[PDB]
């Protein structure tokens, strides 16, 4: 349930990661001393793997929505139990008020 939200925000992270690493590659391929060519291959692989797994996740999510969509408003709800609980709370409050009143009249009789 919440896993869906978590994966979506992780995908947000990977989006900005792909932009960052692409900027890094194009930092490297302007400097005269582009020595870390193994690590240039590393950053190219980062570009590659990032783009594919992002597109993979979104395509899978669209398929999942294509199996769960029906176009109706879903008319369940939870109102009755909430009314019942509110009733019970105000019943207890009534009780607390009457108890305090009795308390004060006994309090004033005990004191002469």
């Amino acid at each position: 349930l919440a896993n869906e939200r978590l994966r979506a925000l992780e995908d947000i992270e990977r989006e900005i990661g792909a932009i960052l690493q692409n900027a890094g590659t194009v930092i490297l391929e302007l400097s005269k001393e582009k020595t870390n060519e193994r690590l240039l291959d590393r950053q190219a692989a980062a570009f590659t793997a990032s783009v594919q797994h992002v597109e993979a996740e979104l395509s899978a999510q669209i398929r999942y929505l294509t199996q769960v969509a029906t176009g109706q408003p879903h008319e369940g709800s939870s109102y009755s139990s909430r009314k019942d609980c509110q009733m019970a709370l105000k019943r207890v409050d009534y009780a607390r008020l009457k108890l305090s009143d009795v308390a004060r009249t006994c309090e004033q009789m005990l004191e002469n």
Binding site: A8, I16, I19, L65, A69, S77, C85, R91
Partner: protein, 130 residues
Amino acid sequence: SKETLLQSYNKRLKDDIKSIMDNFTEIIKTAKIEDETQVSRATQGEQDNYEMHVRAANIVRAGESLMKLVSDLKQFLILNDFPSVNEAIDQRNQQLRTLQEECDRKLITLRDEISIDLYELEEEYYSSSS
């Protein structure tokens, strides 16, 4: 309907993916350094700087479009997800019933205690000569 919206989402995703990939491939297309001929060096240098600038702008726009698509998907799933909705419904109900039961128990015990004392008070009062 719902098929049109989902196929529109698919179209947007594939369009943006091919757009960013094509843009990077064209960036590497102009990236070959060669010898010039009848091209007036400074002119194409300036306009290729211009082209890579506008293409980086296109890359940023592509990232922003992906962010918008992610937000729209997040809105869509929560609103029409039958399974997710049911779980919330079955938990809210259970919590509310537990609270109701506790309140009822407290009231019943209070009533019994007050009755006992109430019984004692009447007996004590009703048997005095005043």
